[model samples]
Target: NVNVKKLLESLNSKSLGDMDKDSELAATLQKMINPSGGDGNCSGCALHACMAMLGYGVREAPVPNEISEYMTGFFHRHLEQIDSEGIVSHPNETYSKFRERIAENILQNTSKGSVVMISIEQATHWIAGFNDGEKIMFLDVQTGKGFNLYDPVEKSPDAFVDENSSVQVIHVSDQEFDHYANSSSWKSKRLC
Candidate 1:
């Protein structure tokens, strides 16, 4: 179900602060968002937003243990209340199928055409450490590569279109990245 090529397009087109910064550039980038159609889109609930910006597959770089634990704890605490409020759907099925079912259910629940949106204003910026630079970037995760923003352009050839340009993304290991101050990477490579 996951398409690598298509996902790449969305990841490269994401913007951080306000949605409308560079009109032409933003317009070109807007083509990458592919909404799954629900609050999933509205709240930007999943990791897809960040995944897109990184220009890599979500399956490759794993979610950090800390964030995973925090999210798990947050869900556990609010699961009951969320269920009572009918915000999330919990059907008896596999995690994969159940995931789809819940999304569809949310779309149904918020029939007024509501979509969850993420505000990166106060959101912490983190990246999955990888050795391949051209492959992915931080945008892949933070903005989820526009997984919740696509609607298909009529003139576009494929089922989707990447309206944004691919910016340079420097790949570095966790340790190297931690040490690097700005996003720009070093030409000097070391064994350390």
Candidate 2:
């Protein structure tokens, strides 16, 4: 009955390392990822993270294949122009607080649901996270794997979040995503 739990089990205890990329879900995600046209580096992490949010019921971007526009344009064009909450953080936040902040951010930011893209350690890496009744799950786009943080003791996987590192998040609903993607066409135009 609960889809996040179903998505968790379907994830099959996957991780960025040793992920089974040939699997069915991986293929679908790849379509959304559109790697070849990405801006390269961790910039595409936004796209990678956003795609996972879709499975968790976040709205899908209208032109996901036009990768670079949303990836490179995200920080400035999307957040500043559209009044995106941008990055959420406090100067002296601790790991425990950072974790809690992300949970809170998801709850407060997205009207559609608890799915949001999280950036850990100041954008060193990016991943998708979702909360269902307070339990959290993550998707590591590096290899198309999922991690569950169902129990408080379980914590988030070290690959995605860890103590001493900072966490920042932004919620991009389908409507918000479309606004950002639609306003620019150069990224897609240059693709050809």
Candidate 3:
């Protein structure tokens, strides 16, 4: 968990300097990573990853030719580090149910992904109501328990699990995302 937090912190702290510096390749990686480094983690955003490829004049999903090399490079470099433990699911649930059963459950029962908006505690309660596998991903969203992208669905009060925790989550949506980000006013203390 500590290591994952440090990794997230390290990733968020850097500017897109030489990330795209493809010494042996044609284009520069920085052009794809930072692109200016403004708007917080703008360049690192998943949308940017998609845009960087499309900017080269390509169109495809799952994977594209323009960004295939870049995606390949990224996945090769990070997948090992990120998914080192391999794809995980809830303890009692089978791999098939992991996605729809568990993930869907979180999105449904707990208002975790509801459009109406919910408190962090409400979100946390739903998060806590999951199996171990679901809990693992939940940690990535709430507690920083051995998870790097574990960001509690709290941005209102701020997404800090503890004093020195480093895990983070940059939720991507149109707008109004900050409303329930991490500062839901449940009792006034703000559970974010």
Candidate 4:
């Protein structure tokens, strides 16, 4: 797989500084994403998270239009890019299961090497994982982070994801993601 570690490592995360700029619309979008009170601050993490999957990061203060444009980069092209591809399992897989599935996918695809894309439902965060052709590495979309996991069962790797967050994954085929990532725009080396 396309140097999953390098692709993720080469990424520079960008935050939506304008999330607080909007008094109504921003709050509205966060609530629309999650109607609870425990969260609403890190919806921008959802936007930043895509950097883990796709290579580009949104550095500007995105409104809906910016998110729409970035999202259009993914499904709009890939889903329409051909060969029967679409959403997998509809997101919202548990942390344990998500963690396990990623491990299983990499283990199964060890021959070809595997790369995983990720998203968090409640926290709106994202983390990626890959075989790295050596060991399993978890890539976080925030603060430019990565972790090594050997025990996939009980060792809850702190900081990459949390218990409150429901982690979802898309274990992409090596060739496709690598090709797509090759085309993705990677410019910024700065981080938050």
Segments of candidate 2 deviating more than 4 angstroms:
1-40, 55-70, 77-105, 108-112, 132-134, 147-163, 180-192
Which residue pairs does candidate 4 place in steric collision? none
Could you tell me how far off, in angstroms, the CA of residue 18 lies in candidate 3 after the best superposition? Answer: 42
TM-score of each: 0.21, 0.47, 0.20, 0.37
TM-score-based ranking:
2, 4, 1, 3
Q: Per-residue alpha-carbon lDDT of model 2 for 1-192, expressed as tens digits? A: 123335546664666332232133433443344334332344454454454445423222324454455555565533432233344445555434554555566666555445566655445555666554544445554444443222234342233433244445655566655554455542232221
Better candidate number, 1 or 2, judged by lDDT: 2
lDDT of 1 at 15: 62
lDDT of 1 by residue, 30-63 (tens): 2333222221222122323223233322222213
Off by over 4 Å in 1: 1-34, 40-46, 58-71, 74-192
Question: For model 4, where is the 10-residue window of minimal lDDT?
Answer: 17-26
How far is 74's C-alpha from truth in model 3 (Å)?
A: 3.0
Candidate 3 matches the true fold with a TM-score of 0.20
| Per-residue lDDT value at 112 in model 3 | 30
Q: What tens-digit string does per-residue lDDT give for candidate 3 at 29-120? A: 22233233332222112322222222211111122323332323322322222323322334444222332333444444433322211112
Each model's lDDT comes to 0.27, 0.45, 0.25, 0.37
Off by over 4 Å in 4: 1-69, 76-101, 110-112, 147-166, 173-192
Which numbered prediction scores highest in TM-score against the true structure? 2
Local lDDT at 94 for model 4: 44
Total clashing residue pairs per candidate? 35, 0, 14, 0
TM-score, model 2 to reference: 0.47
Task: Identify the leading candidate in terms of lDDT.
Answer: 2
